Symmetry: C3
């Protein structure tokens, strides 16, 4: 999964990004079982006053999370991935919930690539990791937190 | 909805961005009936040079609009929406049409959170608005023009 | 198509962006038959340290290629397209493939606008260009490389 996190500039300190991007990652891993290193959190920063809202220019206190998952998960599961991400990013960012937008897109894994490899079905994963090369699995083990 | 509006840095003043948001949001409100505070417009600036049509580098003149909607609307309606957004962003930002690009992807409202709440269907949004805690309803009332 | 290309600030020199946009552009034209000029490469640059993998802040060495396409093409072709993007970008940017992430989404051509016109299916690619207005065609032609 790729999570695009849109935020106004200098709202999250370099430690506020780490805490939020960890909250997201633990949320995913716990709920779906996809390994930590498979999650990516990509903060898109823009100078504040670029988020309009019913024509109303906003400050720099709005966060939009765009997830990109592969298909195969129930709506039940996705509603729970979404609310936990509302609840935990509120904490790690220290921001009220009313400012959080969370959208999820889904795609067939067969047109989804991470670490230069095609992904497996959400009902796979453990097997897929082992049968990758040694150096590929080593580089993956580096990105855990 | 969220509209991601990809614009070259230096193309829109503060006044031009509000003109663009107001046209986008009004167009979305008038063809779907979505109440105003639900249509976010999210400006994303990159330095001129970062856009390559056909492998050719571009100046600050291209606008890519990326709308994210709940599923459920007709193609006819969506073709109207996509044709209005073209004409009204051409006006508000003094641009011409053949520089304007617009893509709509849609998602189950079950996996769309706004203001900390799950989007309903197009067949509900008024019943939805009414049964929110006083704070939620009131915060949304501010973000309307 | 429209490809968003998320990369770190300074990672790609301008000559590098051109080479990579040209790799992707050659990929799409080569395997889908879509004329060069309908292929946009929109580079989205951020400071190094906004990209997190497995909750760990990365250097500036991550690429994320997100392709927005017409619905229509075989899973098999979309695999190859994504594969040839992976290989060609690895080579144009001078970067390992385990740094490259590729997701394709798809939408109805009916909800897709490039140059202010509605895209056709993958089913009238050539006769479509034959009914633009000459000035729009002449505009099309400057974006071949």
């Amino acid at each position: 999964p790729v999570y695009m996190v849109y935020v106004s500039q200098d709202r999250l300190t370099p430690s506020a990004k780490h805490a939020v991007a960890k909250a997201i990652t633990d949320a995913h891993r716990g709920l779906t079982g996809t390994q930590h290193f498979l999650a990516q959190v990509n903060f898109q920063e823009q100078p504040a006053g670029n988020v309009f809202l019913g024509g109303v220019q906003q400050g720099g206190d709005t966060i939009f999370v765009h997830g990109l998952h592969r298909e195969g998960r129930s709506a039940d599961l996705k509603g729970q991935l979404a609310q936990r991400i509302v609840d935990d990013v509120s904490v790690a960012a220290e921001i009220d919930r009313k400012h959080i937008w969370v959208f999820f897109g889904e795609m067939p894994a067969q047109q989804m690539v991470e670490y230069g490899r095609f992904l497996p079905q959400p009902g796979h994963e453990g097997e897929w990791f082992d049968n990758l090369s040694s150096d590929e699995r080593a580089f993956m083990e580096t990105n855990v937190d």
